[PDB]
Structure formats: C-alpha cells, structure tokens
Homo-oligomer: A and B are copies of this chain.
Amino acid sequence: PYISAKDLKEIMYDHLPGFGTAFHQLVQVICKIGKDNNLLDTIHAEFQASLADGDSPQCALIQITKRVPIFQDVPPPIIHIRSRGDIPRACQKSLRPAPPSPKIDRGWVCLFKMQDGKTLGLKI
C-alpha cells in the first residue's frame, strides 16, 4: 500500500488553494523529511485523520508537524537562495528572523539563507 513522496505531495497539493503559499512550502518540507525517514505512510494517515476531525487542510498539515514525532526532532531545513525576491509572493508576509533552535512543530517551516548572509525563517 506504500505511498510515494510523489503522490503525497500530489494529494496535499490538491487540497490547498493559492500557489506557493506557506502551506505549499510546508507540504514540501513534510514530504522530504517523510521520505528520508520512512514515514510517508504515518504522515498520510495523520493527514486523513485530521480531515476526519474536520480540520481545514492547512490545519491538517500543522497537525502532522505537531503529532508525527519526527518533526520535533529534525530542524527546519536550510534552503540556499540568492535574495529574498526568490521567495514566492504568498510567503513574503510570513518571513521572520529565526531564533535559536527554531522548531518545525512550532511553525518554523524552513530557513531561507541568502547570499548576503541573512537568514529568514518561514513562520506559520
């Protein structure tokens, strides 16, 4: 029954409006950490269970970070970019300087590292 990083992203993506929003990014981060730790299934199941509770798909993504334990243990991934323009418009409003040991299950999706040295966290 095992699912693919490919189609999970597909599914979760089907469920959200907009393009390149903080939640599309969060989908990407969840699936990557998903693959590399062999939890794409645990993760799909929590996504479904949260929709059953009545959670908006945004909220469901959030529940994964808070309920699937891997995400309390892997830091938000660093993503090397040139400049802040490279980040999608929808995410612009959600960038914040990151504090020490930023946690995914606290809303820190990823860390954008630009070529001027400045790092900006994507905060949900």
Residues of chain A touching chain B, judged by Cβ–Cβ distance below 8 Å, are 49, 52-54, 67, 96-97, 99, 102, 106-108, 123
Select A52's contact among B54, B99, B107, beta carbons within 8 Å: B99
A-B contact pairs, 13 of them (CB 8 A): A49-B106, A52-B99, A53-B99, A53-B102, A53-B106, A53-B107, A53-B108, A53-B123, A54-B96, A54-B97, A54-B99, A54-B123, A67-B106
List the B residue with the shortest CB-CB distance to A99. B52
What are the 4 closest A-B residue pairs judged by CB atoms, nearest first?
A52-B99, A54-B96, A53-B99, A53-B106
Assembly CA distance A108 to B54 (angstroms): 11
* A102–B63 CA distance with the chains assembled, in angstroms: 15
Additional 7 contacts, C-beta under 8 A, given A53-B106, A54-B97: A49-B106, A52-B99, A53-B99, A53-B102, A53-B123, A54-B99, A54-B123
On chain B, the residues within 8 Å of A106 by CB distance are 49, 53, 67
In the complex, A54→B103 CA distance in Å? 13
Chain B residues with CB under 8 Å of A102's CB are 53
Bound: A123/B96 CA distance, A: 27
